[PDB]
Nucleic acid binder design. Structure first.
Ligand SMILES: CC[C@H]1OC(=O)[C@H](C)[C@@H](OC(=O)NCCCOCCC#Cc2ccc3c(=O)c(C(=O)O)cn(C)c3c2)[C@H](C)[C@@H](O[C@@H]2O[C@H](C)C[C@H](N(C)C)[C@H]2O)[C@](C)(OC)C[C@@H](C)C(=O)[C@H](C)[C@H]2NC(=O)O[C@@]21C
Ligand SMILES: [Mg+2]
Lengths: 37, 122, 215, 175
RNA sequence: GGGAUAAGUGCUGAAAGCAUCUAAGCAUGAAGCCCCCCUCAAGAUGAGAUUUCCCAACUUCGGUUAUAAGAUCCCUCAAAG
RNA sequence: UUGGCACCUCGAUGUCGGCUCAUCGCAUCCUGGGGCUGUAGUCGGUCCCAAGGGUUGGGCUGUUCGCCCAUUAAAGCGGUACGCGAGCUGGGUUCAGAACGUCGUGAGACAGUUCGGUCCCUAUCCGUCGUGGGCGUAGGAAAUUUGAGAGGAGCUGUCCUU
RNA sequence: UAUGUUAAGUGGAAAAGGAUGUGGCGUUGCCCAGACAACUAGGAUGUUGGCUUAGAAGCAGCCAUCAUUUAAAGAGUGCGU
């Protein structure tokens, strides 16, 4: 889980979602899971 | 009650005639030790020859402290001198002609070669 | 589950099975009587009150707690009992089993239970910072003038005050202490004595409240 | 909301009792009773039920489609039933019953026992394929997750309780 | 050993007929939070509760003696100081 | 932290280390929970949640620091007048003596060394740790009490088994 | 009082940057011939042809990237070495 002030899609399969207030990216590559931003 | 900077006699023909201690293994802040406890020590008097020579740093296990030990039945065993035996990091001595008595509490600590190579278990 | 009021007599030792010196505290529990049965709807919590020992009966012109006063005679006569000296109550016990006026007997405890003994400590009186609080004291030489007093009581201008709880000189002892997970080695029904492994708080001739461990 | 408005529901040999808010559905396999959104209204024609949004606000467009699919799940589930299948892969990894509870042997130096609940049934197959069954989709989902959390799949040999037909990303660590 | 949680993990689930931990709801999850365990605690001026004991007789009207029940003075003491 | 400014203090706010006693933050050293990994488990690395507790004994210097020798699960970083001298020391530094090197024609000088060099105070108030008396709790009393709150604990190793 | 805005206690401390948070005003390319979803409908051909490179035929790199079996098709939009 990366927590960075810049959540942006890393791959094309990358979806930005807003869960519980935080802009996150959930992707099928667990490496591309991101949290804050 | 054995703490650091305490001089002990060696009870083996390993080569060290008398040694003093630095730490008592077994815990942060551990300060004292009794029969069946291991320590770090540096010899101060060696025999001419012998496997251990003067100024070395060595593990060792306490045998026959003079403060002595309570046994579960209310029996106490005390001695007239502190003493120690060097070990090879496997609970095994170096000499093979250990001198002086040894307590029976070294049996539990699995220092069995120390208890087997001993004049008197007590 | 079980509770008995007793007093401490002293300490001895018992050689138990397999030859083991068990250090013991002998406790004399005699004529423990239930005097009430507190109930939830009557008092708000269910429990029972036990009176221990035996005072003498009321006399006119009494000058000591040896004899009962009129107020206490009445409380004990409602349980058909003699005036007692020490009265405590127990909550852990289940009230339905007991009954007002019964005798609580040393035999309530069997060998090998787990009990908590609650007494009062021995008084040490006015005691310094290091005996009362275990403080390391200062150097005794090298030109020191700080031998046993407590050190700094605070900081400086920030908190120009001493904070609550600063471990300073006072009166040690006289505190209720509960040692936990002791056990009974033997109960003697004729001399009325419950022997408890270990040691308990208090002066000799004191009072201990033995009940069953809450843990 | 397409899900909500467009897709009309189809009561099939079941009894959808829309009692004000609290609905009930009873059919072949049992009864389910939920409380749906207040503002929403329901129009039940013959063998069809239609949910209606009172407005078009983001608020009355999101709730709308949510509890239009929560009715379908109830009626489709009280009549056809919902089941989840879990496999167990691994030398010595087993699956056995104990009468109203299931014991799992997944290499944990201790047997793990999942106790069953109301309206939920469990079964095994060749000591590997567990099957959770029931009428609520959110009980069959909750339990099947609880029984996969015992040992979820691992990335190196796939060993663990996997959902039947679930891509386990397999890494290739080497000795 | 309970109860509520943190990062996290989910279940059902739409906005956005797909998806999706989220918005409704409902799960799980830490030496952390609350309880649980020890101690002090009704000056808790909100001053709480239970049991018992004491209960008259002058007033000229109580702004009333002295006495109950209970203590203390004083004295022998220590398990307390 | 090294500074810049000169705003309170020169009818005096004792300045450095150490000792005694701590207390608080968390950007966490260990312990607990996790996402990961170029993680097969032990291994390590990274990031997140976490401050409840814990977070050694020595040799060398006045030293803080740092290095070294043994341990530990870890030997955390900071604030607190670089916490705390009306609680302690006084080794360093900063008076008068002396001496060496250097500068000065000289008296003398150097933040260059070196040996020596007086640490006062009976606690009024607030504060804090204990311990009494008075009064109030719609009568006067003896005993047992619930608990609104408050405080204390809160750490963790190795071995065996599977 | 009227009409609107926020959902963060924003109001009631920062910034480069990051974001399917939400409201307004335009501009716009597409759409009942039916754009946009997963619409679970076909997905490959001589053919990696040529340099074919560790052999590697959507990956170590020049791409020469020909028509369509076809309602819809690319010497493969593409996840891969
Ligand atoms: C016994 C009772 C008397 O107390 C005292 O002597 C105590 C001991 C004294 O403590 C101290 O020495 N410092 C604390 C120790 C600090 O050491 C570091 C090493 C040094 C030095 C040094 C430097 C220069 C000179 C100097 O240059 C020179 C010369 O002669 O030129 C003479 N030497 C000796 C110097 C030596 C008091 C308390 C002292 O005050 C303190 O001094 C400081 C200057 C300031 C302090 N603050 C303001 C920060 C102050 O608090 C006084 C000045 O006394 C000398 C107190 C005054 C009032 C008195 O006069 C009283 C009446 C004392 N006289 C007497 O009879 O009773 C006394 C109470
Ligand atoms: Mg002044």
């Amino acid at each position: 889980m990366k927590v960075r002030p810049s959540v942006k899609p890393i791959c094309e399969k990358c979806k930005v979602i807003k869960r519980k207030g935080k802009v996150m990216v959930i992707c099928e590559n667990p490496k591309h899971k991101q949290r804050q931003g | 009650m054995i703490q650091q900077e305490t001089r002990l006699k060696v009870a083996d023909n390993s080569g060290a005639r008398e040694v003093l201690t630095i730490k008592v293994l077994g815990g942060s802040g551990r300060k004292t030790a009794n029969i069946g406890d291991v320590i770090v020590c540096t010899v101060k008097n060696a025999t001419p020859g012998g496997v251990v020579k003067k100024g070395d740093v060595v593990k060792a296990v306490i045998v026959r402290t003079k403060s002595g030990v309570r046994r579960n039945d209310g029996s106490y065993i005390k001695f007239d001198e502190n003493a120690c035996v060097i070990i090879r990091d496997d609970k095994g001595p170096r000499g093979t002609r250990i001198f002086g008595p040894v307590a029976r509490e070294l049996r539990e600590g699995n220092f069995m070669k120390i208890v087997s190579l001993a004049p008197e278990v007590l | 589950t079980k509770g008995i009021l007793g007093r401490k007599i002293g300490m001895t030792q018992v050689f138990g099975e397999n030859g083991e010196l068990i250090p013991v505290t002998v406790v004399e529990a005699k004529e423990n009587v239930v005097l009430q049965k507190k109930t939830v709807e009557v008092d708000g919590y269910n429990a029972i009150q036990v009176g221990f020992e035996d005072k003498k009966a009321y006399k006119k012109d009494a000058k000591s707690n040896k004899y009962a006063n009129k107020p206490a005679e009445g409380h004990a006569k409602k349980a058909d009992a003699a005036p007692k000296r020490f009265i405590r109550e127990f909550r852990n016990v289940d009230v339905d089993a007991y009954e007002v006026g019964q005798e609580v007997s040393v035999d309530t405890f069997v060998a090998g239970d787990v009990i908590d003994v609650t007494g009062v400590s021995k008084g040490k009186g006015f005691q310094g910072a290091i005996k009362r609080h275990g403080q390391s004291r200062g150097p005794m030489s090298h030109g020191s003038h700080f031998h046993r007093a407590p050190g700094s009581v605070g900081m400086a201008s920030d908190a120009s005050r001493v904070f609550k709880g600063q471990k300073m000189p006072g009166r040690m002892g006289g505190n209720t202490v509960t040692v936990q997970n002791l056990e009974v080695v033997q109960v003697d029904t004729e001399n009325k004595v419950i022997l408890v492994k270990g040691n308990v708080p208090g002066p000799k001739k004191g009072l201990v409240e033995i009940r069953t461990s809450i843990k | 909301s397409r899900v909500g408005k467009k897709i009309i529901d189809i009561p099939s040999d079941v009894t959808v009792t829309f009692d004000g808010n609290h609905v009930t559905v009873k059919g072949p396999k049992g009864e389910l009773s939920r409380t749906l959104n207040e503002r929403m209204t329901f129009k039940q024609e013959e063998n069809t039920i239609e949910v209606v949004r009172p407005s078009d606000s983001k608020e009355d467009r999101t709730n709308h489609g949510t509890t239009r699919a929560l009715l379908n799940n109830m009626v489709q589930g009280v009549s056809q039933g919902y089941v989840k299948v879990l496999e167990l892969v691994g030398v010595g990894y087993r699956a056995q019953m104990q009468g109203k509870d299931l014991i799992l042997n997944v290499g944990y130096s201790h047997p793990v026992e999942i106790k069953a609940e109301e309206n939920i049934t469990f079964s095994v197959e060749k000591n590997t394929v567990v099957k959770v069954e029931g009428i609520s989709k959110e009980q069959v989902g909750a339990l099947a997750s609880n029984i996969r959390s015992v040992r979820p799949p691992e990335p190196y040999k796939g060993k663990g309780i996997r959902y039947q037909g679930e891509y386990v990303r397999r890494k290739e660590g080497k000795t």
